[PDB]
Paper text:
The RNA-bound TiLV-NP structure has been determined as part of distinct pseudo-symmetrical oligomers, including two tetrameric forms with pseudo-C2 and pseudo-C4 symmetries. The pseudo-C2 tetramer adopts an elongated structure, measuring 116 Å in length, 99 Å in width, and 70 Å in height. Within the pseudo-C2 tetramer, two A-form RNA double-stranded helices are inserted at the interfaces between opposite pairs of NP, whose single-stranded 5′ and 3′ extensions each bind one of the four NPs. The pseudo-C2 tetramer exhibits mean interface area of 1294 Å2 between NPs within one dimer and 994 Å2 at the dimer interface, while the pseudo-C4 tetramer exhibits a more uniform interface of 1313 Å2 between NPs. The accommodation of an A-form double-stranded RNA helix at the pseudo-C2 NP interface, as well as the oligomerisation into circular pentamers and hexamers, is facilitated by the flexible hinges of TiLV-NP (residues 288–293, 308–319). Within each of the positively charged grooves of TiLV-NPi and TiLV-NPi + 1, 8 nucleotides of RNA are bound as in the pseudo-C5 oligomers, but with free 5′ and 3′ ends, respectively. These two strands then come together at the NP-NP interface to form an A-form RNA double-helix comprising at least 10 base-pairs with a total of around 37 nucleotides visible. Two such structures bind to the pseudo-C2 oligomer. However, since the 40-mer vRNA loop used in the reconstitutions corresponds to 20 nucleotides from the 3′ and 5′ ends of one genome segment, the two observed RNA structures could each correspond to a single vRNA loop with a promoter-like fold, i.e. with a distal duplex (with the loop density missing), and single stranded terminii splayed out to bind in the two neighbouring NPs. In the pseudo-C2 structure, the duplex A-form RNA that splays out into single-stranded 3′ and 5′ extensions that bind to adjacent NPs, could also mimic the polymerase proximal promoter duplex separating into incoming and outgoing template strands, each binding an NP at the start of the RNP superhelix.
The viral nucleoprotein (NP), a key component of the replication machinery, packages the viral genome into protective ribonucleoprotein particles. Although TiLV-NP is considerably smaller than its influenza counterpart and unrelated in sequence, it maintains the same topology and domain organisation. This comprises a head and body domain between which is a positively charged groove, where single-stranded RNA binds. In addition, an oligomerisation loop inserts into a hydrophobic pocket in the neighbouring NP, the flexible hinges of which allow variable orientation of adjacent NPs.
Author numbering:
A (entry chain D): 34 to 309, 314 to 350
B (entry chain A): 34 to 310, 317 to 350
C (entry chain C): 35 to 312, 317 to 350
D (entry chain B): 34 to 349
The structure:
DNA sequence: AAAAAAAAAAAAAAAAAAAA
DNA sequence: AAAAAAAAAAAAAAAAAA
């Protein structure tokens, strides 16, 4: 009925949170996904330490983490999630042992082990996507102090190393900065900061975001952009005739590509980083694909977070 | 009627330095503050050894410090401070034992011990504020060699770990950099290199800095900024009749809003450094007796401005 | 004509019959590419590159070897048709896979040595033609590998054989590696903008010169590429009704270029350019004309964008 | 008679190059030092391969290196250096095995092994210094294409990873770039680009560069600066009364102390990486000074405003 | 505000520790 | 000048690699 990824995510969430997992709230799904991701990187207290090439301080931190008691059952997580007594069984069963690699499992040849590893990787990917989406949603109302210049804002979102490894094409941060600065291999992916990510309640059902869906302005905006993208993207929403909290998606932005403006030095010339302004820099236009067709909407010239705050005024 | 914070420091300084402690000389107050800070941090000779996890060299240094003869009455600390015979009693009775933690003091329930611990903590905060002000004052005429590039200049003042542990919001340095390069949370504080610190002679008596109070140019400049800040801040000081190295404050700069107005390039649009928006035309907001005014930046560091205007 | 061009002309004739037009850039480029593939044993039914090939590479080489070879009359490009003689040529002139000049020299066979030298010259000519075609293509559509000036510095990006044949002109990954290798007498500096006559001029030894009828795109490709400065367009003047034909009025200098930086040291201030001391869009290029060198102000836009705007 | 480092370098060069090692030429000493460095890093053909964490291409390259025959006795290196028949014995004896670490040897406790490891470390450092000096000397007459902007020139000289590991305080390149960009630990060292490196003929003798020494202009300049440094440094040379090709050193430049023209942002203002440049002035830039310590005393010499390489070319 | 908690008597170059 | 060597055929998601 559903692909492997969504099926495994639903199974894991149901097993670990029992009946307390709501399937129609973005925050609850996000909390469940974040908790599950924590459960799969060997980061929770009482899990195997990371000491392969750990510095003395890292050795101490990992030893302290290992010594500390693991989370107990019946524990409240997030706002409306309560662990079930059988979460330990799922953790012991479906969680690969620390250091597990696909090469070793394939050499062993165990079909069950291979399937469990595939499910683990798929759940990692789905939870990383949900966590990036929730990061976008948070940035729509609460600015991050770390981001202070376009040079820093270029690497948003800031996420842990395992998050970068799972989805290098979507997750930025320190690891993405190092990868971009270092040698670029065959597996290098450029940080597609504004990739489309369906909301949590759709990302676990497979219903791809599209026109006609009934969604809130904040959730749609965090899906298609983040806190510091231009406010013109707000045009992609239309309030409904009812309460107005949940509207309808009318159109989605289109990703422009190409058209480099560099001019390499030759015959005694000097390089030009950008050939280009004020009039076009301010107004500008963005291509929004609607049901009727593509429309060029002039950019509002302001941050999305500022636009949302002003509208809330 | 001074707050307990300043009362504790005044009493300690009196007990430790007799009449030699002048409450009107900034250098003397600073020397006494540093002395009290090193005493209450267990760094004076003959004090307990920091050998909880000391390395070989650090273990040897701590053992030598413990073995070394402790300071005696009549010792000269600075230029115009002399220890008294009561300093030994003050250290024995007021300084908490090495490694003492407020958890154990609260668990014991002794009200006197809790009061002593609170007094020690407040005294450390006061002495750290005074030390930060002294670092700002010194850097107005002689810059730290560790400051070579904007990255290094972003972390002034460079004070030891204990100082940062006392007032995280003011002291920069290696520990501030480490905290910056580590985890962040509610308990995390931001280094405010230009947070207003009243001068020592004004700090220990509770007098807040305000327009119209007699101060020196260096005093105000260190009390509102440091050596490498834009020279425009010098406008906050105006000499009196005949100057005489003493003037008056005419304003106090306002702080910058932390709101970020960036708009990152996306979907083909062009990135904007400031949605609201020349470099030498920027203005600072000064709160004067009348109201807020805008003063154009000078473009030169206070250190260089003082060097050039010295003669 | 020099043997370097004579070998290419003879091979092209023997392979393509009379269909090999010698006055069209596209036809010559297609023929050169086909000959380069033939002499690299990259065609169907040719040898297999299995010295150290990995499992998948080994399998693909085996499949290519087993795959049927091209037959006479095959249509290559748009206006080139193979001749039955080509096989014989491919049987004789093409060196066996893995043959090294050391073994040929040790053998002492004069015929084999001459064949190897002819093969090397043919490879050099084919690589030059491929570089010109790459510039021509880049003049309309840009490769995505070039996003920053650092990546643009190594254009064109060609295989290792291309760099080996003509290290002076070809760049790519192998040129990047050689830059980090070491410096010596054999070391040749990359010249991204060397004057290469169009294929219709190269195979006949028609060195580009002022007064030669050439298309604007032809001249731009032969003396520049897509991302160069648009001011180079000053070197071409149209004719009656243009009609994609004009004339060369001048050529840019060979563009040696020296670095005039002065890095800060011992407290002195860094200088980004020694000459400028005492404006970014005011820079000018030197063009040698029939009369003398002239300074032409830069346009500030890449040649690609200039051409795109001119088209529409 | 001489420190440990110079003694071990002389011993190694004498053992490896026999009597063909000319002790009074810069180029010959540089070639010998570079060859010793390559031998001691296990990069000569016929030495252990580096495969601990090697990528497939690196594995192939190292396997090819291992398979190839090692250099034979009498092979010509550089210009006037010929290997002796006993170089293989020295390479096998004095070169620590690939992956050798000082911790393992210290745990073993073998005095001979510890001494050999210390000698290898010292020779690595001396050869790195010689090769850095030679890179400078080459930059005085042959520009580098890699250096197109001040950002790139900030990392000169470029050298291999082991070269950076041996002498982080002088060697730049990719590895210094990575260290600076990444976390800065307790062992981090800034690139002292223009440190004073006595010529290789003195660097192997211990005669520190100082006033009164007879040296060429090119060698002295490469010792106290590199290709793109300011031209005023040429004032540190005084042509002799004879031919004038080879002169004497009068004074050495002093690493400036006091230039802190930064202006950090505060109260909404913006940082200034350098006051003079942002001042939009040229008068100061043409009237700078450099503090040359001479025999009589310190002197302030006005900067010539042109690259050292260009000044050398124009003089010739 | 309450809580929690490394050659300018004392800040470059070379050495022993650590390790394109 | 020589030697040494979703615009029949260019993003998103999956199985390979990590």
């Amino acid at each position: 009925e559903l692909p492997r990824n969504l099926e495994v995510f639903n199974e894991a969430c149901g097993h670990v949170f029992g009946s307390s997992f709501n399937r129609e709230d973005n925050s609850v799904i996000s909390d469940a996904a974040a908790f599950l991701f924590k459960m799969h990187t060997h980061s929770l207290d009482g899990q195997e330490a990371k000491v392969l090439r750990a510095s003395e301080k890292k050795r101490e931190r990992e030893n302290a983490k290992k010594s500390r008691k693991a989370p107990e059952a019946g524990m409240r997580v997030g706002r409306s999630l309560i662990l079930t007594s059988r979460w330990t069984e799922y953790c012991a069963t479906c969680v690969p042992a620390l250091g597990s690699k696909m090469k070793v499992i394939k050499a062993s040849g165990d079909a069950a082990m291979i399937q469990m590893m595939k499910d683990h990787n798929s759940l990692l990917r789905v939870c990383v996507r949900i966590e990036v989406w929730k990061a976008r949603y948070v940035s729509l109302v609460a600015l991050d102090e770390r981001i202070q210049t376009l040079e820093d804002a270029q690497w948003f979102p800031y996420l842990s190393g395992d998050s970068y490894r799972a989805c290098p094409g979507l997750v930025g941060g320190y690891f993405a900065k190092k990868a971009a600065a270092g040698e670029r291999g065959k597996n290098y992916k450029k940080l597609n900061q504004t990739a489309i990510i369906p909301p949590p309640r759709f990302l676990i059902i497979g219903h791809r975001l599209q026109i006609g869906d009934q969604v809130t302005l904040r959730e749609l905006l965090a899906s298609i952009a983040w806190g510091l993208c231009d406010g013109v993207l707000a045009e992609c929403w239309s309030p409904s005739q009812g309460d107005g909290s949940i509207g309808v998606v009318v159109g989605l932005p289109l990703q422009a590509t190409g058209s480099c403006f560099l001019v390499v030095a030759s015959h005694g010339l000097s390089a030009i980083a950008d050939s280009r302004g004020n009039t076009n820099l301010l107004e500008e236009c963005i291509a929004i694909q609607k049901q009727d067709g593509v429309i060029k909407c002039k950019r509002s010239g302001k941050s999305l977070y500022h636009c949302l705050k002003e509208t809330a005024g």
